[PDB]
Amino acid sequence: ASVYAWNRKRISNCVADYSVLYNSASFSTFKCYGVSPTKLNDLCFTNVYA
């Protein structure tokens, strides 16, 4: 979607492997703010939105 009408998708009831996001070189910017990128596999979350 466009930036004025940005698409929000809910993520729930799944096990997420974020290690394939850090190790992939396809992303020019992979920047996390309130959490370390490498600790994402060790934590549990709810209210995940993309």
Q: Summarize as ranges the residues that interact with other proteins (CB under 8 A).
A: 25, 28, 30-32, 34-39, 42-43
Angle at 35 between CA 50 and CA 14, to 5 degrees: 45
Q: How far from the centroid of its chain's Cα atoms is residue 18's Cα? A: 7
Nearer of residues 7 and 23 to other proteins, judged by Cβ: 23
Q: How far is the CB of 14 from other proteins (least distance, A)?
A: 20
Write the Ramachandran bin of 12: left for phi over 0, alpha for psi from -120 to 50, otherwise beta: beta
Nearest approach in angstroms of CB 18 to other proteins is 13
Q: Least distance from C-beta 33 to other proteins, angstroms?
A: 9
